[PDB]
């Protein structure tokens, strides 16, 4: 299917957007975000509507849609 675009909001209000498929395991987004922030992936927690995003969660499982927001907090 089509890519959807998700907005990842950092603790400093910065944003990095990601295009993912509905079947993409979100570990791939977590790893890329952590790489671009220059921090270990295990130092961060990623939330969708306040709930923790697991490595093997997909946008389909979480009910995500185009332009949904993920927030990043310190673990």
């Amino acid at each position: 299917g089509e890519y959807i675009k998700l907005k990842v909001i950092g603790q400093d209000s910065s944003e990095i957007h990601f295009k993912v498929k509905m079947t993409t395991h979100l570990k791939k987004l977590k790893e890329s975000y952590a790489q671009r922030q220059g921090v270990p992936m295990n130092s961060l927690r990623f939330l969708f509507e306040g709930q923790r995003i697991a490595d093997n969660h997909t946008p389909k499982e979480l009910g995500m849609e185009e332009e949904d927001v993920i927030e990043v907090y310190q673990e």
């Binding site: 944003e15 295009k19 993912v20």
Partner: peptide
């Protein structure tokens, strides 16, 4: 900041 959008995407082996 500028907009940032990231796209998340053996027989040749010799080692």
């Amino acid at each position: 900041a500028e907009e940032r959008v990231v796209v998340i995407s053996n027989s040749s082996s010799r080692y």
